[PDB]
């Protein structure tokens, strides 16, 4: 974990998102690309209810 | 050194637009190679609306290392408190043989035409020997070398003018470098220079489309003919768009409007030209030489240069047709 920061916002991309309660996001990354969608799953034990995905907007959210 | 140094400045307004009729002046301090310095006499001129660029020329003492020029703006309304001031610096050509080279003219027209033979004045200031074997020049464009020239040098004058015929291959833009070789008692050292060559945009095969009926306005639904005309066999791609599409919004630029300018990006080198010793001028022109005389440092890979039903909707007439010589279609 070097301080850096690795983040270049001139490249326009999202940071690692915060999962719902009981977390567990798969394929963990430090910086996500715009238009990329990451699936979220639940820890042992639960079941994902509803549409489960997070898509990176053009803006950082 | 010994050659008058051209300085051409341009003033832009708040948003990316040139201004004219605006007087500007500069202050410079010429320093001597050994030490100390000298203050150069200031020069004032205005930017012409027609040209768009202000022109300055500074002649310096032969013992100058580098020069610094501070450009400031001058207007009767302009206060000294709120004004525009930009300082700049230029480093001299470095040669252990003390010999230099320079070229003139080149696009002041503005730009250039096709088929016309153009002459360029060159000077070999501070030579080791006034007698030079032969003059060699390489004209390049589109990131490639189009032609290889050769010339002879005579004592008839201090500055010789070389004539370069322009070709169809150079249409968007071009660069020309002129190098002359000398033979020293130990090792040989060649000197060169390069300048950007701008030229009129002209297609290899001229394409002209014109409607067969000639009228200011056409009645709706009128059967009309369209005529394609080309120099050589060519495929045409037509698009007929309404003028009302743009429209939304902010002018919506143009369908293309920039092609040769986008085709001009093929150039490997950056800037107009010139550089330290022989190497830097070549690499800035987009080339790397291989010779016995001078060594070429590549400065690694790094290139800092960046900017340096119906009736009736849109759109219709989306087609691709082969056009041998002249071809016509009716609709």
């Amino acid at each position: 974990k070097e301080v850096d920061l690795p983040e270049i916002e001139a490249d326009s991309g999202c940071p690692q998102p915060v999962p719902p309660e009981n977390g567990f996001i798969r394929n963990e990354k430090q910086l996500y690309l715009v238009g990329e969608d990451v699936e979220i799953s639940c820890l042992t034990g639960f079941e994902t209810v509803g549409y489960q995905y997070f898509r990176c907007l053009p803006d950082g959210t | 050194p010994g050659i008058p140094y051209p300085i051409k400045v341009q003033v832009k307004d708040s948003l990316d637009q040139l201004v004219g009729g605006v007087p500007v002046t500069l202050n410079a301090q010429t320093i001597d190679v050994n030490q100390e310095t000298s203050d150069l006499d200031p020069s004032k001129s205005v930017t012409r609306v027609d040209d768009g660029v202000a022109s300055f020329v500074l002649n310096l003492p032969s013992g100058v290392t580098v020069l610094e020029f501070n450009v400031k703006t001058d207007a009767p309304d302009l206060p000294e408190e709120n004004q525009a001031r930009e300082g700049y610096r230029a480093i001299a050509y470095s040669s252990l043989s003390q010999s230099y080279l320079y070229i003139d003219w080149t696009d002041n027209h503005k730009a250039l035409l096709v088929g016309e033979h153009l002459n360029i004045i060159v000077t070999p200031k501070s030579p080791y020997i006034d007698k030079i074997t032969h003059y060699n020049y390489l004209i390049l464009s589109k990131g490639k070398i189009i032609h290889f020239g050769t010339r002879e040098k005579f004592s008839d004058a201090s500055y010789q003018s070389i004539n370069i015929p322009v070709t169809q291959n150079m249409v968007p833009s071009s660069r020309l470098l002129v190098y002359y070789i000398v033979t020293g008692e130990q090792t040989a050292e060649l000197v060169s220079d390069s300048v950007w060559l701008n030229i009129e945009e002209k297609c290899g095969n001229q394409l002209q489309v014109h409607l067969s009926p000639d009228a200011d306005a056409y009645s709706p639904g009128q059967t009309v003919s369209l005529n394609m005309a080309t120099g050589m066999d060519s495929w045409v791609a037509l698009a007929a768009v309404d003028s009302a599409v743009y429209g939304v919004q902010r002018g919506a630029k143009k369908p293309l409007e920039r092609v040769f300018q986008f085709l001009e990006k093929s150039d490997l080198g950056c800037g107009a030209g010139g550089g330290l010793n022989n190497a830097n001028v070549f690499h800035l022109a987009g080339l790397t030489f291989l010779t016995n005389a001078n060594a070429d440092d590549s400065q690694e890979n790094d290139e800092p240069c960046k900017e340096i039903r119906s009736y009736f909707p849109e759109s219709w007439l989306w087609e691709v047709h082969l056009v041998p010589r002249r071809k016509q279609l009716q609709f």
């Binding site: - | 320093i31 030490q35 290392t65 580098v66 070429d296 440092d297 400065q299």
Partner: protein
Amino acid sequence: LLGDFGPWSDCDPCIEKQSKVRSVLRPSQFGGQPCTAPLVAFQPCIPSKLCKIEEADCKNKFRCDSGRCIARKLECNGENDCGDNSDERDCGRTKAVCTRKYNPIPSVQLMGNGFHFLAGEPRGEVLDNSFTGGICKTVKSSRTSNPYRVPANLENVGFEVQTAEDDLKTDFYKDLTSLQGGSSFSVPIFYSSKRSENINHNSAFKQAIQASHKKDSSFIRIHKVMKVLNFTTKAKDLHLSDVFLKALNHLPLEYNSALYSRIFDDFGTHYFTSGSLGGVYDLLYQFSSEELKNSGLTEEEAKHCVRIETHRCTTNKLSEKHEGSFIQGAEKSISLIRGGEEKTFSEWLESVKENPAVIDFELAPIVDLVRNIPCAVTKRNNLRKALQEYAAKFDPCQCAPCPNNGRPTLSGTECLCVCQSGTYGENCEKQSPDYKSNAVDGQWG
């Protein structure tokens, strides 16, 4: 028997040549027209590169024509060097920094360079202390001058000449040569280990041991030391020589015994940490052991007789000639001196101030200086494996046993077979009337 010829690879451009090297097997011992026939043969090639120092990154700039890159902002003042000839650029045109005109140390090059442990010579330039570092530091000395500017590479330096002998008078360290630590830890080498001495000195003795022929040859030694300077090198970060780094920059990334072996040959096995510079008066004398019995036996005594300049002890030790002839004063004397009318010793004493030398030196491995280069870690380890195989060539083994407990040595391609006192002539062919041939002590092997 020498060895098979090596193939040619990786052209020189800096040297603009193609070279190969041959290994040597079974070095000459008793005679038989030794190896000769130069090991490395050079051939003309076609240069691929421009012979420049290459460097990774250098985002912080500002690069030099040599390519040292000089991380901090040196430009343009004061010294504007970064390689020969001052590489310009740097300068010009803007003055100034580090004013007041400080004078450099007469010889900074000897504190630089490097030392070959096995050969005993300052082979080639490594340190190159000429680098200023942008910091202006100077030390003042007795008799000189004016101040003297301190190189960045040296951590500390001072002129410690004090208390007129005294020191050189308490010197000469009377010793008669005959038949941590520890001494066994000096065999693998690998720096200090407190390498400060631990034995020394530079070996020109190849002529002395060869002169042990036909005689019993008992030796005696006296030495004086005058330290004009005491220097210490900063071990954290060092600015390498343009020459050394150039040959270091261009090396095969794969391990090559031949090529890497040329590094130690050219630049030396070690570099100096701490240590002092100056000059020394060293002289070795040879006397026949038959003479000590005829002239009377004085062991601890007559060792004091060596002092002399400036009938028992009265006239002896290098006959005048006639005045000492009856008391002998034979035979041969050699010059072990290092560094540098009326008072000839004072003539070279002032000369050692003009042209000094490294006297008492402490060293560190050359492998420690390979830090911060392209593929640094890779070349470090490969250089460690190179020295291990390199030291093997010099360490005497195949020299074969010498009769009468003789210890074999190694000088170039010849063993020379140094024999103990009481042995007649070189190669241990004959024995003295002292009649002890029994010993024959063992060694590896």
